[PDB]
């Protein structure tokens, strides 16, 4: 009942910028191997045990924010189902530790060899300690996202990464078929060690608040071109089928003539004297007509893209000539330009973009073909192993190869343009790569509510490091963390990305900044005015007004606020040191203004917006959703009914809604070995608990999920289905196979309501309400589901000491949606007898006020810690690998909520 407290150490994570994954037709290998070396580990730098874990994590949910979190805090690898870590004695997954047998098992000592083997084709995560096998493997885990090496460590440790090649020696022989992790680096990015998604990084003049980081996706490794098969070839194209081929039969050959690669009559192409500028008739016929139909293939790509041709001006054939230059002179059957010659011709930007995507669609077809012949990507070229450094999609290719591909087809489209045939741009369709996660886009920062100002004149700076979508200004204390700044009345913010002032909408103001600019926000509570100054110059609106916002009520007061979009860096200077300010002397000093933190000892505490879903009670003032507590009658159990207030009206909100009850139920410590009147002796001894949920008529069972959730469920998806449920199976056996322990770990245990509805042809609105029942047995860890008084083949078994919250995920399709009935079946105790200790022998249903429905907020506020761990990442050497160092200890005081199991 009472909140617990403890002192815990800060835990951080470090990863190399290496990403792997599996997808349909993906250009990525499906087996990888890395190692770590332990240099120094202090067993107890503080009272808390030193933390060090090594493992794999996933890019769509492993975001270990520093400080508090799941369990007793200090979360790292394995504290959630988006990571899978090994510590020397336990397998960490979902904040659960399970011991592993090893030949000389112990915690990670100095100079220990840890080898992580990952298979993507079949889910399997295998570890090796000092070469010896670790008798435990993660299996049957969700592959969506990208897998990466990661290490979670407390203070006072030194470790080294071994990635193979020049970034590790591996000190052992990896199992065959596991590619060393140094080969997974993308061409555009160098190998480096980075922390996981952060909101702060140290800078020269001060800390730099950082917005969300753009994350690469597995879907970005499948090359998806436009199909060039179902295209009937037009007459105007077959009419020009020849010259556009003749001009690309030796265009690659033209560059190297009169050099060391100068042709000779005895040999032909590919013999280090390639050119053969004579003609393609001398060249072999299959590759010849192949080059013709490749020119046709490029024209077919132009068709599929949306390019069409039209002839207006003088025929270029007349006013074009072939130039027998002194260069490219050859003795084999006369001399001529290797491609077909062309005179002065230019190209507009539409043609530049079109040839860019034309080269893209050439590259992605080539890559698709290579993958279909089995090939894959590797930063070092291996021809007998059939791997290439250029098997990545064009968007991920390097600029050198991009330019090299674009040059040839640029010449081709130039030759097409010379003949006067128009290159018609297609229609423009605006598209967004990622749309679902609208909340993982911005990160709001503001001072603490105790620094609220209601009088005087205040000033602070905001050095815009980047030029993306960032905003800065002032805000009221009750700002909603999941609403864009300026979209409501709670913020007076200046969006200087395009020069706009935001309050209840958008309207232009001033000029957009550039890199290295400083946005010094004024405020005058006496004059009720807000002024934004850029680089020491007062900004001007689209009128004679010199003040951005006028006639503002004092209200609760105002807080200096700012936010950053994806991939942005901002330096916020609240003026704790007056001398550190730059444009204060230029603007503000003579106006009577003061720095916001003029006389303050400690740095001003800032609260950022944490993009981690949490369960909060349904607000009583919520416009859309309302929860009604129904008194239990003589014949009906007490009910927690959900009713959509504005279902069917204009501006109605309909979305995937996650609901859970406030209090959980915990399974017993040790599992047991091996009418409608309840029997008194059975009822006083049974450990089975039942509850019934009634989906109302008109609410579709196709979007209903009923069951239980562990307190670490944070999956907020608008397209939720049972496939997205996180699950993993731990497999344990002796030294030589012989699996003797196979468990399933999940944060989510529900069924789909569409399996309990008869396959009717029509009339999906059921005349009879679906009453899904659920049962649990604490003495066995077994849970079951009942459809309409008849059981269902699905069943679940869970480990002891498990906390489960009654949950219902529903997409509303009616005014009346869900109703939690706290009922009881024959010889089965109610939930009020399950979650209340002083009611363990009372079979009568009860609904005490602490039991209330909660729904999943997507975003919530949080506090930025006043100090962070000092991590030194660097390359120790070519043989040593990459080293990570951390020395200074840092301790926090955590407040652990018992029932929610979070601190």
């Amino acid at each position: 009942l009472l909140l617990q407290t403890n002192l815990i150490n800060y835990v951080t994570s470090i990863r190399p910028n290496i990403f792997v994954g599996r997808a349909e037709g993906s250009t990525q290998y499906g087996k990888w191997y890395f190692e770590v070396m332990v240099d120094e580990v202090v067993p107890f730098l503080t009272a808390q045990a030193t933390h060090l874990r090594v493992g794999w994590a996933l890019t769509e949910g492993y975001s270990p924010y520093p400080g508090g979190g799941e369990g007793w805090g200090g979360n790292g690898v394995g504290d959630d189902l988006y990571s899978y870590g090994f510590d020397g004695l336990h397998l960490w997954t979902g904040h659960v530790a399970r011991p592993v047998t090893s030949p000389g098992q112990h915690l990670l000592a100095p100079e220990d060899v840890v080898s992580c083997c990952l298979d993507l084709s079949v889910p399997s995560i295998s570890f090796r300690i000092n070469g010896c096998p670790v008798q435990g493997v993660f299996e049957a885990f969700n592959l969506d996202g990208l897998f990466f090496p990661v290490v979670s460590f407390s203070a006072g440790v030194k470790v080294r990464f071994l990635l193979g090649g020049r970034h590790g020696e591996f000190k052992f022989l990896p199992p065959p078929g596991y590619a060393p992790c140094h080969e997974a680096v993308l061409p555009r990015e160098r190998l480096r060690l980075e922390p996981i998604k952060e909101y702060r990084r140290e800078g020269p003049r001060g800390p730099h608040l950082v917005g969300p980081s753009r994350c690469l996706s597995h879907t970005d490794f499948v090359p998806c071109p436009v199909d060039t098969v179902q295209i009937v070839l037009p007459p105007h194209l077959e009419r020009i089928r020849e010259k556009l081929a003749e001009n690309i039969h030796e265009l690659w050959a033209l560059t190297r003539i009169e050099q060391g690669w100068t042709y000779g009559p005895v040999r032909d192409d590919n013999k280090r004297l390639h050119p053969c500028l004579v003609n393609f008739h001398s060249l072999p016929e299959p590759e010849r007509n192949y080059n013709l139909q490749m020119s046709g293939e490029t024209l077919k790509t132009l068709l599929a893209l949306g390019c069409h041709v039209g002839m207006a001006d003088e025929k270029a054939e007349d006013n074009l000539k072939k130039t027998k230059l002194p260069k490219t002179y050859m003795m084999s059957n006369g001399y001529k330009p290797a491609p077909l010659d062309l005179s002065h011709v230019r190209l507009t930007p539409a043609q530049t973009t079109l040839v860019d995507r034309l080269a893209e669609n050439g590259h992605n077809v080539w890559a698709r073909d290579r993958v279909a012949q089995g090939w894959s990507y590797s930063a070092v070229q291996d021809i007998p192993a059939r791997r290439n450094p250029r098997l990545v999609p064009y968007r991920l290719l390097d600029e050198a190869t991009k330019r090299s591909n674009r040059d040839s087809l640029c010449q081709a489209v130039r030759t097409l343009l010379g003949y006067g045939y128009n290159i018609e741009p297609p229609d423009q369709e605006p598209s967004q790569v990622e749309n679902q996660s609208r909340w993982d886009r911005v990160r709001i920062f503001r001072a603490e509510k105790s620094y609220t100002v209601q009088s005087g004149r205040w000033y602070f700076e905001f050095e815009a490091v980047t030029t993306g979508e960032m905003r800065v200004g002032w805000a009221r204390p009750e700002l909603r963390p999941d609403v864009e700044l300026g979209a409501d009345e709670l913020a007076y913010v200046f969006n200087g990305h395009r020069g706009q002032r935001w309050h209840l909408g958008s309207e232009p103001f001033g000029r957009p900044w550039q890199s290295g600019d400083v946005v010094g926000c004024m405020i005058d509570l006496t004059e009720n005015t807000i002024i934004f100054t850029l680089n020491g110059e007062v900004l001007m609106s689209d009128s004679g007004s010199e003040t951005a916002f006028r006639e503002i009520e004092i209200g609760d007061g105002f807080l200096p606020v700012c936010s950053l979009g994806p991939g942005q860096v901002g330096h916020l200077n609240l003026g704790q040191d007056v001398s550190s300010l730059r444009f204060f002397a230029i603007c503000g000093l003579q106006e009577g203004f003061e720095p916001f933190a003029i006389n303050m000892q400690r740095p001003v505490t800032t609260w950022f917006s944490k993009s981690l879903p949490q369960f909060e009670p349904v607000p009583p003032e919520h416009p859309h959703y309302e929860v009604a507590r129904m008194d239990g009658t003589v014949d009906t159990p007490p009910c927690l009914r959900l009713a959509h207030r504005t279902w069917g009206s204009q501006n109605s909100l309909v979305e995937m809604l996650f609901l859970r009850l406030s209090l959980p139920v915990q399974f017993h410590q040790h599992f047991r070995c091996t009418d409608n009147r309840d029997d008194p002796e059975i009822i006083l001894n049974t450990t089975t608990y039942y509850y019934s949920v009634r989906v109302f008529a008109g609410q579709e069972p196709s979007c209903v999920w009923v069951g239980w959730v562990t307190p670490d469920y944070h999956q907020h998806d608008m397209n939720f289905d049972l496939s997205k449920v996180r699950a993993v199976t731990v497999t344990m056996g002796d030294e030589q196979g012989n699996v003797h322990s196979s468990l399933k770990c999940s944060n989510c245990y529900m069924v789909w309501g569409g399996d309990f509805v008869s396959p009717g042809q029509q009339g999906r609105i059921s005349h009879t309400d679906l009453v899904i029942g659920c049962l649990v047995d604490l003495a066995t860890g077994l849970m079951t589901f009942t459809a309409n008084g008849k059981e269902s083949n699905t069943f679940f078994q869970v480990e002891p000491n498990t906390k489960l919250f009654p949950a219902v995920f529903v997409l509303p399709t009616h005014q009346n949606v869900i109703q939690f009935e706290l009922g009881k079946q024959k010889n089965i105790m109610p939930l009020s007898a399950a979650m209340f200790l002083s009611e363990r022998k009372n079979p009568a249903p009860q609904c005490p006020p602490r039991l209330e429905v909660q729904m999943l907020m997507p975003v919530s506020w949080s506090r930025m810690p006043n100090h962070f761990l000092q991590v030194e990442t660097r390359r120790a050497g070519e043989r040593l690998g990459w080293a990570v160092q951390c020395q200074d200890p840092l301790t926090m005081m955590a407040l652990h909520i018992p029932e929610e199991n979070r601190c």
Binding site: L7, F44, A47, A49, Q105
Partner: protein
């Protein structure tokens, strides 16, 4: 009934015998994972006189097996622990305890 799992091995040849006191840093936790006692927070070694039964039985006969310099994890049943009477306001009745014992030195 006691179970001892090594966390980090020590010496393995010098075992705690009668006559010399045992000096440890332990960290007791309840079975649910909620820490209830530790010695590093008090920042003072817990020297207990082995053989005179002044400490709980489970801790006493689990300290005998493990050797010098060894970090060992125990699991004391309520029978070898406070049991049904429990500890007033500290340990719930009939609870199994876990200890992160380390014997840094014998005197």
């Amino acid at each position: 009934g006691v179970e001892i799992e090594t966390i980090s091995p020590g010496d393995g040849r010098t075992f705690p015998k009668k006559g010399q006191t045992c000096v440890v840093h332990y960290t007791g936790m309840l079975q649910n994972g909620k820490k209830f006692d530790s010695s590093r927070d008090r920042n003072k070694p817990f020297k207990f006189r082995i053989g005179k039964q002044e400490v709980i039985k489970g801790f006493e006969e689990g300290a005998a097996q493990m050797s010098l310099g060894q970090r060992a994890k125990l699991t004391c049943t309520p029978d070898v622990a406070y049991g049904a009477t429990g500890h007033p306001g500290v340990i719930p009745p009939n609870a199994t305890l876990i200890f992160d014992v380390e014997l840094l030195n014998l005197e």
